[PDB]
Amino acid sequence: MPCYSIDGVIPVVSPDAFVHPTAVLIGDVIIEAGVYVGPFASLRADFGRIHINQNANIQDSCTVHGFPQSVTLVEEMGHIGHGAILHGCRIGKNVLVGMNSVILDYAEIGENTIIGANSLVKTKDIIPANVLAMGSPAKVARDLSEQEKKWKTRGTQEYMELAQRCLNSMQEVQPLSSESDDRLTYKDFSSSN
Amino acid sequence: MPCYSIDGVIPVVSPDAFVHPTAVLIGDVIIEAGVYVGPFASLRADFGRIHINQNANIQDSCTVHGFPQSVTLVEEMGHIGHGAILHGCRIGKNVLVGMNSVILDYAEIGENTIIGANSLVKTKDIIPANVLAMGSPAKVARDLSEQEKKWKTRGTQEYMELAQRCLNSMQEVQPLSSESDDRLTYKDFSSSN
Amino acid sequence: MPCYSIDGVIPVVSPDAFVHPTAVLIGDVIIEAGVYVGPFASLRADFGRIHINQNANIQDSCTVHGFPQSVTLVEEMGHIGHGAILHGCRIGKNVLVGMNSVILDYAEIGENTIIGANSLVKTKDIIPANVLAMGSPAKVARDLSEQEKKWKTRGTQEYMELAQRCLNSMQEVQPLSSESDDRLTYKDFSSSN
Ligand SMILES: [Ca+2]
Ligand SMILES: [Zn+2]
Ligand SMILES: [Zn+2]
Ligand SMILES: [Zn+2]
Numbered sequence A, B, C: 001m002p003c004y005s006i007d008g009v010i011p012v013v014s015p016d017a018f019v020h021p022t023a024v025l026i027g028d029v030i031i032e033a034g035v036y037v038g039p040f041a042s043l044r045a046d047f048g049r050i051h052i053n054q055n056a057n058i059q060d061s062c063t064v065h066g067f068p069q070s071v072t073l074v075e076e077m078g079h080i081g082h083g084a085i086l087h088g089c090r091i092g093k094n095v096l097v098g099m100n101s102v103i104l105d106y107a108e109i110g111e112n113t114i115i116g117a118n119s120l121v122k123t124k125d126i127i128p129a130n131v132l133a134m135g136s137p138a139k140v141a142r143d144l145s146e147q148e149k150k151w152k153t154r155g156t157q158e159y160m161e162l163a164q165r166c167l168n169s170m171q172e173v174q175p176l177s178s179e180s181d182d183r184l185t186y187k188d189f190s191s192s193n
Helices: A147-167 B148-169 C144-168
Strands: A003-005 A026-029 A042-052 A064-067 A071-074 A085-087 A131-135 A138-142 B002-005 B026-032 B042-052 B063-065 B071-074 B085-087 B131-135 B138-143 C003-005 C024-031 C040-051 C063-065 C071-074 C085-086 C130-136 C138-143
Touching: A042 B148, A064 A071, A071 A085, A071 B131, A147 C040, B042 C144, B063 B071, B071 B085, C063 C071
Parallel strands: A003 A026, A026 A042, A042 A064, A042 A071, A064 A085, B002 B026, B026 B042, B042 B063, B042 B071, B063 B085, C003 C024, C024 C040, C040 C063, C040 C071, C063 C085
Antiparallel strands: A131 A138, B131 B138, C130 C138
């Protein structure tokens, strides 16, 4: 069971979201439809609230937390890369937070923006829409190209389809002990076509 | 069960500490009273010993490890931020290790010091007491203000109370499938008063 | 059970590898003999394939992932440090990827090379054999010394022995509630001799 209450406060999870059985949701976490929450994601709403809006994804070993009475918000189609940490911040619609990046309290990321991997967005920093920001600490570098925004959108659509594939077919299994010529492989994923 | 033995060596956990059921304690880990160990914290004492002293906290997806026959020590009121990695080091009393930072072997952090997020403290580095150090690799920047030390203390007191709240009331639950007007929320946490 | 299928694709795990019960293997992951997979390692082969070759190790809260139809490869004696993230890349034989580092898509790391902790290897970067590379973003700094390569080899041999120790003796246990003079400790690990 990935969900835990604290002080009687129970997570809310849309039946149309996928939460991997190894993630942890604590306290006042609200997950909307279409969301993918990956392995070892910790959505810990024991000091404040966390709200993950529709069609967003939270990837592996990501952490979402905040200070007392904070609200940590990931808006629609937010795309939180592996190992990123979101603390008391607002992630705008269709933002990409790069792998292993840290977004600190009261920061806000404007819509469609991309945060590079390994970045740190300082507390209270307001990053505008449609830009690339990177570094540790990060700063705004330039506007995104149209190609970059389409690439980002496609990547989030893959995670929207991933949530459905996982709700449809992910199950615990005993591993095989060797390969074989007849086993299903990554070539049998729909992405192969 | 978060505890695992190796070579017959069994973790020691104070009944007055909280270890989240999804953390992992392996081998010669000793946890003292008042400690909070969060989700997916890996306290892996399969090469050496780990000792976490009273009223300290280890946050989500943190890792504590060391080389063979090492001793990795977090002293009283040590505050290990989300995703930090402690390797074969000594964390002094009431230190704050910022989110996603790495502290390498034989490093020592003096009491009350704050390590910024996303930092790397090099092997064998000796950081004095009562300073701010940050960067990757990190260096000492300046002394802490009195206000900064009081802020840090308050944050660790929140985790001391968190361990008690979790021992008192954290339990596995089925999530709710939608919000409602009568559900308990983060506004019902004591921090609201 | 650490293994999950997706679209009917089942992980392959050598009976001579150790996968910690808290890791997660999804989809087309193939693990060869002698490998150690640590706590909260996420080997997520739901977009492409992951292949971990013999005597390699993947450490705590590491993530291995890739884009659709990618192949993410860790060659023999690859040594993936705590919290590192491997995305769609090729890790050469006997490479060390430092803690909390990110290796991006299509990058290749030549044999015996060492990537410093907290590094970022950019997409499509080709790092040669037998060097040290570090930084975020990283660059090649210098060749490794002979001493450095022997030190690295010894560290991977410790993980080769660790997999056997874990297959031999790691088990879930109730923790002890206090220390005692007769308990087994890290001094009873073979490394003590
Ligand atoms: Ca990290
Ligand atoms: Zn926090
Ligand atoms: Zn280690
Ligand atoms: Zn990925």
